[PDB]
Each structure stands twice: as C-alpha cells, then as structure tokens.
Design a protein around this ligand. Sequence first.
Ligand SMILES: [K+]
Ligand SMILES: [K+]
Ligand SMILES: [K+]
Ligand SMILES: [K+]
Ligand SMILES: [K+]
Ligand SMILES: [K+]
Lengths: 326, 326, 326, 326
Amino acid sequence: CRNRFVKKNGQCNVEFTNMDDWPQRYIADMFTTCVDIRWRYMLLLFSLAFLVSWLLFGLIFWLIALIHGDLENPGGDDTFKPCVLQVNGFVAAFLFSIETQTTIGYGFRCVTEECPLAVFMVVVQSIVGCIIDSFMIDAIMAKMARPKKRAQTLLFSHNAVVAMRDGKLCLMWRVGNLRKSHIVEAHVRAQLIKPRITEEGEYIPLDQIDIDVGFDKGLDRIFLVSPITILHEINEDSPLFGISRQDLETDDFEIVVILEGMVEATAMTTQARSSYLASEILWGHRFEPVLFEEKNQYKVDYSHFHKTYEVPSTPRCSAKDLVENK
Amino acid sequence: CRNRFVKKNGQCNVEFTNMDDWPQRYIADMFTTCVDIRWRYMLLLFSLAFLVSWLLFGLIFWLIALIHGDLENPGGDDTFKPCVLQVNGFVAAFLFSIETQTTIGYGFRCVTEECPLAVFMVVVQSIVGCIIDSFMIDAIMAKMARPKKRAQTLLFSHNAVVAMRDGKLCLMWRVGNLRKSHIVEAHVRAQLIKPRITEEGEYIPLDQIDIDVGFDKGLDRIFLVSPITILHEINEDSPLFGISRQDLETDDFEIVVILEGMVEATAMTTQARSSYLASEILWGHRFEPVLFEEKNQYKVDYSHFHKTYEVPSTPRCSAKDLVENK
Amino acid sequence: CRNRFVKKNGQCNVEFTNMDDWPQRYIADMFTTCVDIRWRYMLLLFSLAFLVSWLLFGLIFWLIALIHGDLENPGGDDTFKPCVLQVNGFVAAFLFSIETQTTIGYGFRCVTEECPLAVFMVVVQSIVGCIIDSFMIDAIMAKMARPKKRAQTLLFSHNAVVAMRDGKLCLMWRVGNLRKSHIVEAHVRAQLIKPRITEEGEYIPLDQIDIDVGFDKGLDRIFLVSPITILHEINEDSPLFGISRQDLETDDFEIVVILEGMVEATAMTTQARSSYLASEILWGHRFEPVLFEEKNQYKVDYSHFHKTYEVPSTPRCSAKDLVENK
Amino acid sequence: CRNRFVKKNGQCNVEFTNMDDWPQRYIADMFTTCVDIRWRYMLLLFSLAFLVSWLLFGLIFWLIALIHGDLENPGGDDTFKPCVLQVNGFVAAFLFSIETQTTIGYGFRCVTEECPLAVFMVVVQSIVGCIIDSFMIDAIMAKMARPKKRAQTLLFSHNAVVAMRDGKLCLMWRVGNLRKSHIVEAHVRAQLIKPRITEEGEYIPLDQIDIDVGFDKGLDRIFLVSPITILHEINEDSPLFGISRQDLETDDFEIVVILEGMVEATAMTTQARSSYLASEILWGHRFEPVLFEEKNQYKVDYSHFHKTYEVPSTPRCSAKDLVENK
Ligand SMILES: [K+]
Ligand SMILES: [K+]
Ligand SMILES: [K+]
Ligand SMILES: [K+]
Ligand SMILES: [K+]
Ligand SMILES: [K+]
C-alpha cells in the first residue's frame, strides 16, 4: 500500500519544504544551481547575459557619441574626428557593441584614437566578453557532460526474485549495460526501506537497512560485460531472514537497488537506481538466460532480460524456518 | 573552554607560520594558487595579462612604424607602403594590437605584405593570444567548478545527541541535502579531538581519534535522499565509553564530523564539515522527525531539522557503567 | 575449445542483440553516444552542424535581401540603404552568414542599422554560434581526453604461471607501465570465467568467480614503478584448489585480469584488461627478472618481460592434494 | 649502500629499456604523450600546427589566385572579379589564411562570391581552425591542471623515527599541508623495499612489502589540517619485527611512503611520495610539536616540522625481543 520512496526509473519521490534560507545558499553554490536548471532556462539565462552586456556597452558608446557630438558628424572630416566611426544612433552603437564583444568587428563602425574613454570601453568590453564567454562555455560544457544521463543506458530488471542457489535462499535482481563502453569501478548496493519503531519507542519514518551483497569480501564489485544477476544470500544477518512467501505477498516494504561506477569515456561516477516493492518480488522464480555461445563470440538476447520462470522445488518458508528445521 | 579546531560552518581554525620557502613551492604549484586566490584578484590578474600583452605588442608595432617611417605617411601612397596601415601614433598601435590579439580586427588599421617583421609579430601575437586565452578560460573554468561550494547546500545539525537506540547507548547527529541532485558515493566520518599525554609522557597537542560510524561493515556509506541520522554506538572500543552525562557537561573535547561524496552534476568530491564541542552535545535527547507520508509522495519539513526533544528514560551513566552493572 | 569472453588486448567479445528501444535511450544519453562514435563520424557530424547553421542563416539573410529589394541595389545609395551591404545573391548571403557566425567578419558584407530583423538575426546567429562552438569544443575535448587510451601503454604478460612461492602454490601474472607517469590509486582484480550448473540445476552461461589477489588486506593495491608480479595464492578458498597440472592441460576455463588506476596527468580512471585461457597458463614456470641494479639507478629490461623458465621442483598435483598429503 | 628506488622528493629512480614498440603505443595513446612532454616542446608543437595550417591554406589560396589570374589584377574591376580581393603574392595569401583561420579577418584581403573553390577553402579552413583550436586549448588546459604539481605543497619529514607510543614500539613519520585548501579523501601507504630470495630460491630484485598503517580499520584515512604523525605499530605481522637499533644502523633497506588524496579545488587525485633509507631512520627519537594553542585559534610552526629529540627510555632491542622477554 504505502507509496514508494524511489521509482522504477531511479527518480527519488521526496519533496523538500520549509527550506526557507535556500536562495542565499543556492547563490553561494551558484555553479551547481546553473548546471541543474533545465536547458531552456540556461540557454535563455546566457542569451540574457550577452544581450544585457551588449545593450549596456551599446548605451555607453552612444552616450560618448552624444556628448562628443558624433551623432551630427559620424563619418568625421578633415577637422573633426569621432570616437567611433559611424555611430549615428542607438542601433549603430548597439551594432558596434555586438561587433566588438563577439569580436565579429565588421569595421564599418570602428573605434578611433581620439577618445581615451572609448578606447577604455573597448578594452573593458573585450575583457568582459572573454569572461562571459568562459562562463557560458563552461556551464554548457559541464551540463553537457553530466554523467547521470548514463543511467538511461544502464538497466535494472523490472522484478527481483527469491530462489535457491548453491544451497542458500537468495534474493536476486539483474543489471545490464546497453553500451559497448564499460562501467569502470562498478559496484552495487541495496537497502530495505520501511518505517520502524525502536524498542525505546522512537518512530523512524523510513529506516534504511543494508542488504548485504558481498561488500565484506569485495564481491559487491562487479565486472559487467553481459548482464549479471546480483545475489543477496538471505541468512541470519539479513533483514529478510524471517520473510516467507506468504509474508512477502501481504507485507509492505521496499528494496532500493543502486549501481555505481564510472562512465568509461569521461571517468565520472554515475549512480543508476531502481526499486522493488514487496509485491514486485517474485518468490520461487529465476531469470531466463540471455548469454549464449556463438561460433566466434558470445551474444546477449536483451528480449529475455526481464523474463522469469517458476521453480516448484523452491521452499515456501522463510530462511529462518529453513535452518530452524534442519 | 579550549577554542575549537574546526567551526560549525566547516572552516578549519588553524594558521600556518614559519613556512618560509612557500613562494618557490607555490610557483611550482601555480595552477593551484591561481584557483584559490579570490575572484577579484584573479579577474584582475588576467586583466593585467591582456593589458600587458596588448601594450607590449602595441609598442613593437609602434617601433616598427617609427623605424619604417610610417608615422609620417601612415596611409601610404603609390610609392610608399607602410608595415601596418593607419598606425599613426601609440594609441593606433595599441588599437591594432588589441584588434589583432582579441581578433576583433576592425581593419582600418591593417597589416601589409611589406614588413616580414610585422608579419612575424602578427603571427607571434596570434599564437600568444591563443595561449593566454586558454590560461584565462581554464582558470575561470576550474575556479567556477570548485565543488567545495556544494557544502553550502549540505547541512549538519547544530547539535549532536546521546540516546538509546535498539538497546545501545549512541552518539547521534544529522545530515541533510538541500538539493534535488544527489551526493554520489556519499559516506561519513567522525573524530574526537583533544590534547593527550601518552603513557611515555609525549604531549600530542591535538590527537585525532576515530569515531566509529560503521566503516568495517560499509555502513559509513549512506544513500541520503531525506535527512539521515548518523549513529555512533558507544561501546568498549569507543573513546566515549566512560563518558557519562555529568562528565559531558564539565568535559572539554570536540567531535569533528565529515560528509564526503560527489556532486552528481560534475562528479567531483566535496567534503562538508562541522563540529560539536562537549557543551553542544545534548545528553538524553533525540531529533524530531522531518519525513512524513503524503498522498502520492514523501515530504521533508526542514523547519524541524535541528529540533530535539528529551527522553527521561535515557540512562545518565556512561556506557561502561551501563555494561559494568548488567 | 570454448571461445573466449575477453581477448588478450582487453577487448570484450560480446555482442548485444534485441536491444530494441536503444535509440530513445541513446538520445537521452547523447553526450555519451557522441564521444564513443569514432573520430571520422564525429568531425563530420560537427562539420554538418556548422554547414547547416551557415546555410540556414544564409537563406534567411537572402530572404530579407530579396524582400527588402537589396538584390537590385546591394551597395545602396543616398536614398536607399540595404539591410546588409553587398548581399547580392545566395553565395554572398552564405558568405555573410559564415563571416558572422565564425566571427571572421571581413566586413565588405556588413549588417546595417536599417532592418531590425537583420539585426535580430545577427544577434541570434552570434548566440547560436557560441552554443554550437561550445558543443563541438567539448565533444572534441572529452573524446580527446578519453583515458581508455592509457591501456595501450600498460602491459599484461602473454602468459600466467603456476609455481611455489614462500611455501604456497600460486597463480601468477605480470603487469607493467610503459611510461614515466604513474598510475595513481592502482589496484588489481581477477576472475575465473566458466559455465556452471548449480546443485539446483540452474545453468549459468558464464559465471564470474573472484580470484583473490589480496583485497581483504589491501594488498590488491599496488604501487608499480617497475613491473610487478601479481600473486593468487591457490588455497582452500580458491576455485583452482583442485586443479593440478594434468587438469590444466585438458580443462576449459578463462582467467580475466584487470588493472584499474588513474592516469597521473588527468586523474581519470583507466581499466586495462587481458585474459588467460587454461591452455595459456604455464604450470611449473616462473618469470625472468627485468629489474637490475645500476651505478646510480635501476633499470627495467622490457625484452625479458614476457619470458619464463621452468622449475622442476614444482609439484604437479593440485593444492588440495598438496595439503591432503602433508 | 644499495642506491634508492625512490628519492626524497618523490621521484622514482627507474629507467625503462628495450621497450622497442613504444612509438606505436605512444601514438595510440597520444593525448597522454602530449600532456607529459614539457611545456616548451608542447607550445612549440602547437605553434607548428598553426604555422603549418596557415602555410598550407596560404599556398592553396595562392594557387587559386595564380590560376584565376588574380595576381595580375588583384583589386579587380568592372569586368574582372578575383576569388580573393588583394591576394597579390604569397605573403598576401599567407596573410589572408592567418586572417581567416585566426578569424582576425582585417578584410582588406577578402573572399568573393566568384570562386566556389575559394568559398570551399574558407569553409574547410574555418572548420579546421576550430578543430585545431580545440586540440590546443585542451592540451594546454589538461597540462595546466595536472594535479601532480600539488605534491610540491605537501610535505613529508626528512626523517622517520622509531619510538614507543602507548606501550607499542612504532615506526613514525610526519606529513603536512602547505596550503589552506584541504586534501580530500586523504589516505596513506607505506612499503618496505629490499631484494629477497624465496625459500624456493627465486630472486626478487626489489620485493615490495606492505607497511601496515591502519588499512583494516580505515585508520589509513586521515583528515590533515595541522601536520600529522603517521604510525606503523611494529608487531609480529610487521616486517620490522626483528629489527633492533643495532640492526637498523647496519642494515640495507628502504621505506617508501605515499600520501594520496584529492586537490580540493579540482577534486583530482595527487600522489605525494618520499623515502627513508635504513640510515635515515632515527631510533629512539620523537618529533617536536608544531601545533600550539593561541587566543582564538591554533597555529603551526613549520620551522619545527622536521626537528626531532632523543628518548633514552626507548628500548634498543627489536619488537620481537621486546615481547619474547615479557
Ligand atoms: K573583422
Ligand atoms: K574542461
Ligand atoms: K573579426
Ligand atoms: K573592414
Ligand atoms: K574573431
Ligand atoms: K573587418
């Protein structure tokens, strides 16, 4: 029943409220804010930064021309020389500004030697334009690179299963790579999520309890070429020790699964996520194989990635009762 | 009493003195120096690099024009052709330099085919301008990206508490994320800081003693969506084993807490810090919940993040006496 | 017999099929796709992005000139002023577009103050050109940096060997650095690859079984200056415990070896790989030394890197029988 | 006597010879080569790339002008229009090439609409110039960022010492940060380096044997604000277990020390190194303190960083004999 902490696609279902002092923090941590806000708003924010600087300097060059009297004699002559040739109005001043900062510089409109202030504005604008260009480029460059996107081409199975492997009752789920490029330093985690009351009567809204998948022997570290089935041996130390098939079909909990590792190309860590409600766990099932031998290679059939099949010999009791008996 | 090693905001309160050979080291490690020095001074340092190069080449082009006799006939004619059209003085030479290096190139001032030296300067300046532009861009790009800034949007609680959980006396503190973007490969550390004399009579000004929060089982690794309460079970192996409530209110020590993990966007490791003096630790208290169930999601009420409430049933004695008795 | 999971050069021999929904995923994870597709196609893709944008804006400027009547009077006069000087046809419009977006801006063709639409196109194109330039630069920058390339200058030996060291039967293989720059945070892994049927009758096409090389004591972490010989002590916990020399020469399995660590320069993790078929493992052999003392240094003779030599005293039985006897 | 594997400044003293196939590998791993070769040669290599491309296209534009007959009528007239205005010789063609690729584009020399080949060269050169600019920028950007440089501002002590702490005989050495910016995820390693013959008579030129500094409890992980003294408890599992003071003064071995961690700014892992010959280890000594209490802070006196002082109560026998007796 209880709605889920994290969805099948990995997105976490939690909203933060009464975080009143956030704008001051988001300002101090601005580069972070900027790479998170969605494309449309960023490209717009940087369009504004150009437009604003272009209009700003455009105005200054216009003022200089207004004061110097260039608007009445913009081409100059033998006696009179303007600060900037051909600034005859605001649009021309705007054009000169864009031409200068972009560094297009068609040159019909052109700064002269006459006005040290105009020369200074060209100096300052050039330097400002380099700074702004850097900021844009960077933000775009960072945002482009964001390795969270790699989780789209990493795949968890829709279902987890419980079944016997090598004499032990195990929780299992599957993970796969939809690319030729590897996930480097790849390793996995899992957590049981449920509310809990401590023996001292403390209510934990959602306690996160570790699901052991081999950390202590380094077996949480995986080298995934073809899809792999992750194993959680359900034993005395597991929080599913007393969970039988009957319990599972009526119980209310969640199992969050995580795959972390580096995108081979950029060597930046991504974190793929998914989840399994107690209802989505299939007792007495196993995954259908996807790897098979070829003439000169192996092949993975991703059509059979999510598919499972029942195993009647699977005990229906919990792992506690399975050992309590024998 | 004793002033603190690290402040609540994470900044470390230590000054380095008699580090006499630092400038030679800071030069060899220059990129590091440059990204650390504050914005104002960096933007100024790069403004100078442009201005210096602009003035430098400006001077050379002026000298060439002076020697070649272009200052007396800058437009040239049927018989005489200058090295650079329209370099009539220093300002013009300066303008040509800026126009060339920025690559604005209005073109009224324009290099000719006549002087192999002028042609060589345009070649060298162009190449110098690319180098300098790279250096600026980079520094700005690095400095912009600095992931320490992410610690502003990560939150430790103002207080740590001591209380019973699941039959064990525990030190606790809370950590939270003020963003939707995750901290990847997130994990926590803690250290007790105090002076110490060894049995051999050695004085350690500030010994740093580990506060176990689950490293040996990988439980120091956390997946924080909603705020989490970090647990240090106070047992025989803990350095707070013999610390009772009475001791805590009169004792003088510090507990430094660290949260490390990667900014999801850039996948760069940040290190959030805070601290708790013995006085700031609240014995017999617990944190008020912030996570609650909604219709279709969960919600975190950050107004109640720092709030605590007393628990009278909490034993007042140390964990040593708690086990010495039973 | 069975063909190998991963080749000597580290490339994995697996093809993914029936991955039907890949284009939608590869689009959402586009930056990843782009850095993977080989140079030729990327440089072409970015050549198209310029050409397309250049043609696009070229067409718009031409339309403006067509409508405004500039094609009949492109230089303008005392009464008539064009939107863009000297746009006399499509090629001229194309030239103006390239000149503007590249920001070359020769200026013979030059935007005027007359047409707010032309002024707007110059604004939009400039901003589009900055965006596109960023995307190109980035992709090229990422692709250039790709640290997988570092595996070319890291070397596994062609053969693994089995031999006695310090009273224990050990699997061994060698690793080496072909550069002066180090591999930082370097560490090693190994896995036995073979098909397997579980006692419950489940077929695992290729189970991956850990080959212990010292993870639990941190001895998998290596500091490689000169070549190093990696050791897998074959003991009760090893999956080669019951493998004797006779078994090895007739058995069918694979040993995949991995060296992970960061390129000192970029501090990006690379993952060098190789493999050993059961046939490629030389029982009763040891590697010939390559490090020798010099006058003022040490020297590595990479000619003798792969060379081995037999040791008759090596027991021919498995490590199980070696301990079963004594 | 035997010369040392790694020097006090961290540089490793090993030369690689008979690495015959290196150029083909260094080519495949080119980005790596490029960032390693020293500044002077890189800046020169990129100067050549510009010069080469500038000369190349310069030549093509000249050929076009030669064939089209522009060299005889470079300004054009009412009947004749050149491919590129004012290309009157090679220097002019060279100038036009530089002007175009740099995108300075003074414009006196200017491509026309006349020659589709000239228009194509401007297109191709622009695109080539963007590519080359990217390569340069990148290389410079990577090389600039190289985090090895951070090891200059990290400090090992000149000496290691042996002394008693808390009832155990310990090897000790000191590490320090010469910056305000932290080393994130900082941790330490150590290795004993000496030649060795195995009981099976195998000669290991330089075996590397781990010096335990707390890996198994995570105590190798350090949070260094002020300088820290690293401890290696010399016990039964240590390879210095049977080393007494007398042995140390006549013995021949080396102790390599490593500090790894991320530069806070760039979050890139650096690896500081140093070494101690058996002669450089001071038995019965301890380091002088450098941290002392101030009014409102702490202060580190780096003048006393390397200084030690004797402790007569230090046992002169090995840790083996120290426990063999009691
Ligand atoms: K121009
Ligand atoms: K970058
Ligand atoms: K220009
Ligand atoms: K011009
Ligand atoms: K330009
Ligand atoms: K121009």
